[PDB]
Amino acid sequence: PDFYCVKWIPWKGEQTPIITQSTNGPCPLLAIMNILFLQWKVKLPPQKEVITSDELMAHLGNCLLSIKPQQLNFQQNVDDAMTVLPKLATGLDVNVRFTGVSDFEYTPECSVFDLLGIPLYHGWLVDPQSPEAVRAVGKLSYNQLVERIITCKHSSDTNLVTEGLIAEQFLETTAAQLTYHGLCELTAAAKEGELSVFFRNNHFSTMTKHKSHLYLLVTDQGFLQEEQVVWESLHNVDGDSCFCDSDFHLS
Amino acid sequence: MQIFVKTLTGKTITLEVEPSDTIENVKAKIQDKEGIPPDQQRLIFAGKQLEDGRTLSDYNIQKESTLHLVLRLRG
Ligand SMILES: [Cl-]
């Protein structure tokens, strides 16, 4: 319903809760909250087996509203964060740029992440090895790309028409929204032991890098009983993905 | 009638609809046979975005018309 199961794991020698997800549940909220649990910035009592969206909001509120600044820029951000909280549960709008694993159109939505010090990533990157594609896509965000593709379809100008077709096949071939280059850059760009949020295919995940390896936190309700299953390889682009325990050992 | 929906992966799904059908019905049909949520759907035809309230005859969509679907990014 509107309840989420709590799962306890041995994280860095401590009993730590993480929250498991429905089928199409509240994954941004979850991606964020699970980071906060893993950092012990939010604590649940030992016997918590279930938690509600409202409680999560309350714990989240305690984080956001307890943050102190490095004046007026700061307070604006915080309300933009507050205003967005409901969308954290029902679906959040992102608009990636294909130039880099941190490149999004900056919106209020993104600001929550920034206030909590939580990096936000995607791996939907145009291959630098193909200059035609790099030129066509340029610095355009996804939303601009689909508009441009449309404009170009209506032109009979060869340049525009060519630009569009290249952009189209970029979107067609990379529709999984993760590329080998994105994967490599994620690898090199993410820092060891940092917890972050990874966008892909309209899902937000809790991500970390450990010994140069990238993992997504397993929140699937199916594995609620299996303590040994905590981390899943961010394995690209498709194929068998290995599971690890809390300590990043094969489970 | 039979129409075509072009998924970005390249696959072209075929759909059976009626000109009186609403855009909200068609997204529900694409979901019902491709699993993509109707909210994550944006329908494009002749360089126009289709709106959930209107019907197919409102855009003069005829048999074997190819509708373009764009995913909006919402996790
Ligand atoms: Cl961290």
Residue numbers in the entry:
A (entry chain A): 111 to 180, 187 to 367
B (entry chain D): 1 to 75
Provide the publication's sentences verbatim.
Here we report the discovery of a new family of DUBs, which we have named MINDY (motif interacting with Ub-containing novel DUB family). Found in all eukaryotes, MINDY-family DUBs are highly selective at cleaving K48-linked polyUb, a signal that targets proteins for degradation. Our structural analyses reveal that the catalytic domain of FAM63A is a distinct folding variant of the superfamily of cysteine proteases. Collectively, our analysis of human MINDY-1 reveals that it is a chain-trimming enzyme, which uses the Ub-binding MIU together with the catalytic domain to cleave K48-linked polyUb chains from the distal end in a stepwise manner.
C-terminally propargylated Ub (UbPrg) is a potent and selective covalent inhibitor of most thiol DUBs and forms a vinylthioether linkage with the catalytic cysteine (Ekkebus et al., 2013). We purified and crystallized a covalent complex between MINDY-1cat and UbPrg (MINDY-1cat∼Ub) and determined its structure by molecular replacement. Such monoUb complexes represent a product-intermediate state with the distal Ub bound in the S1 site. Refining the structure at lower resolution revealed that Ub exists in two alternate conformations (UbA and UbB), with each at ∼50% occupancy. The distal Ub rests on the stalk subdomain, and the region of MINDY-1cat that makes contact with Ub is conserved in evolution. The C terminus of Ub sits in a conserved catalytic groove, and L73 of Ub sits in a highly conserved hydrophobic pocket. Binding of UbPrg to MINDY-1cat does not induce global conformational changes in the catalytic domain, and both free and MINDY-1cat∼Ub complex superpose well (root-mean-square deviation ∼ 1 Å over 244 aligned Cα atoms). One notable difference between free and complexed states of MINDY-1cat is the movement of the Cys loop (β2-α1) that in the structure of apo MINDY-1cat blocks access of Ub to the catalytic site. Movement of the Cys loop also rotates the catalytic C137 to bring it closer to the catalytic H319. Our analyses point to a substrate-induced conformational change that remodels the Cys loop and realigns the catalytic residues to an active conformation.
